[PDB]
Amino acid sequence: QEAEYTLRLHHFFPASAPVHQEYFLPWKEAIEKESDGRLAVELYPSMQLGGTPPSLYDQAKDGQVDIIWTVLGYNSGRFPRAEVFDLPFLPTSGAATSQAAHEYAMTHMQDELEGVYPIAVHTHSPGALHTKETRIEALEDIEGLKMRGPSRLVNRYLAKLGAEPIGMPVAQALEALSRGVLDGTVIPFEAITAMGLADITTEHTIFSGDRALYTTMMIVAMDQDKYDALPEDLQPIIDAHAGGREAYRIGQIMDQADHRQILAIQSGEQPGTITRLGSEETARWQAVGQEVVDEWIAEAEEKGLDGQMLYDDATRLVERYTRAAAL
Ligand SMILES: [Mg+2]
């Protein structure tokens, strides 16, 4: 059939992005086929419909476009309950942490996400430590390093570890590293390569055990008004391709992409070194992490949020979905 509704999906990443190739393309297919063509989905990567990434959330909410994919934290401070997912050593895999974020958001973020229909609230694959020169084999080795963290809480963690955290827009990264304003940065492996950093930051440190350094919360968000305008027999087609199992899948795609990057470095296909810290060393980093958690909880309480309850629920959910997947 001819399209009754055309859903324009807008995001910042290139069409070659794993999520675009492996999630949005099949999402588009399923929506179109299951609606018998009544729903068309048009994909616009690389900000091809205009603006910059901090404007995406409002582009969907305001109905300029129908669906967006974005980082909540691009509007820093806008989603204060979501920030719990930025804490050090909270996440496990992108897949399981994603499923946990979705459920957390459905429980706690109904007002924070008012006006969007959440196709998937998820996280990216957990990040790692990337430096030009310093092989980080112990906590002591990060002391004094100029490191760009990708969130407030990761920068706070960096400062507790004794690094000097430096805030700047993401586009300034490659160049601040090359200019020597920065020693390194904290981001996933897929982001290192896509940013043109794979030959600049050739030392990479990851950790032992069933928790990883950090992630942040992302969303595939539809204008609630557009969802509400769809007929009763088409809304369920969207519902069938929305929710926590979609979030899991997005996270898993991002996990697979980061794993391929690690394999490439380990094989020699890409240059550099991957250092994994042992268990006991990793515990020292987690102990510092716990200080950031405790500070976040206190600050949240001071502002009227039940921070302890939220942290406890985020961590409960991460454990739930990690265990379910391991089985
Ligand atoms: Mg709206």
Ligand 1 centroid to 227 CA: how many Å?
9
- Ligand 1 (ion): which residues have CB within 5 A? 61, 63, 223, 225
For helices 279-302 and 307-326, the axis angle rounded to 10 degrees is: 140
- Give the Å distance between the CA of 151 and the centre of ligand 1: 27
| Ligand 1 centroid, distance to 223 Cα (angstroms) | 5
Q: How much distance in Å is there from the Cα of 116 to the middle of ligand 1?
A: 7
**Cα 109 to averaged position of ligand 1 atoms, centre (Å):** 17
Report how far ligand 1's centroid is from the alpha carbon of 81 (Å): 21
Q: Give the chain's count of helices (H) and strands (E).
A: 12, 11
Going from the Cα of 118 to the center of ligand 1, the distance in angstroms, rounded, reads 13
Q: Please name the residues in contact with 281: beta carbons below 8 A apart, sequence gap of 6 or more.
A: 137, 138, 139, 208
Q: How far is the CA of 9 from the centre of ligand 1 (A)?
A: 14
**DSSP states of 244-306:** HHHHHHHHHHHHHHHHHHHHHHHHTSS-SEEEE--HHHHHHHHHHHHHHHHHHHHHHHHTT--
Which three-class secondary structure state does DSSP give residue 182?
coil
> Rounded distance, CA 290 to CA 40, Å?
47
Contacts of 71 (CB under 8 A, 6+ apart): 53, 216, 217, 218
Q: How many whole angstroms from 82 Cα to the centroid of ligand 1?
A: 21
Tell me the CA–centroid distance for residue 324 and ligand 1, in Å.
35
Residue 83 contacts residue 155 (beta carbons within 8 Å): no
Q: In angstroms, what is the span from residue 61 Cα to ligand 1's centroid?
A: 4
Resolution (A): 1.6
Contact 84, 121 (CB under 8 A): no
Tokens describing residue 154 = 């990761």
Q: Give me ligand 1 centre to Cα 220, in Å.
A: 14
| 78 CA → ligand 1 middle, Å | 17
DSSP element (H, E) containing 73: none
User: Is residue 66 a known part of a binding site?
Assistant: no
Q: Is 146 assigned to a binding site?
A: no
CA angle at 87 for the pair 84 and 92, rounded to the nearest 5°:
100
- The token duo for 279 is 């268990």
Q: Is 225 annotated as a binding residue?
A: yes
Instruction: Give domain limits for the chain.
Output: 1-327
Q: How far, in Å, from the CA of 67 to the mean position of ligand 1?
A: 11
| Residue with token string 């690389």 | 46
Taking the C-alpha atoms of residue 129 and residue 164, their distance in angstroms, rounded to an integer, is 14
C-beta neighbour count of 247 within 10 angstroms: 31
| Strands 39-44 and 5-11, sheet pairing | parallel
Instruction: Please report where in the chains the tokens 């996400």 appear, as a residue.
Output: 113
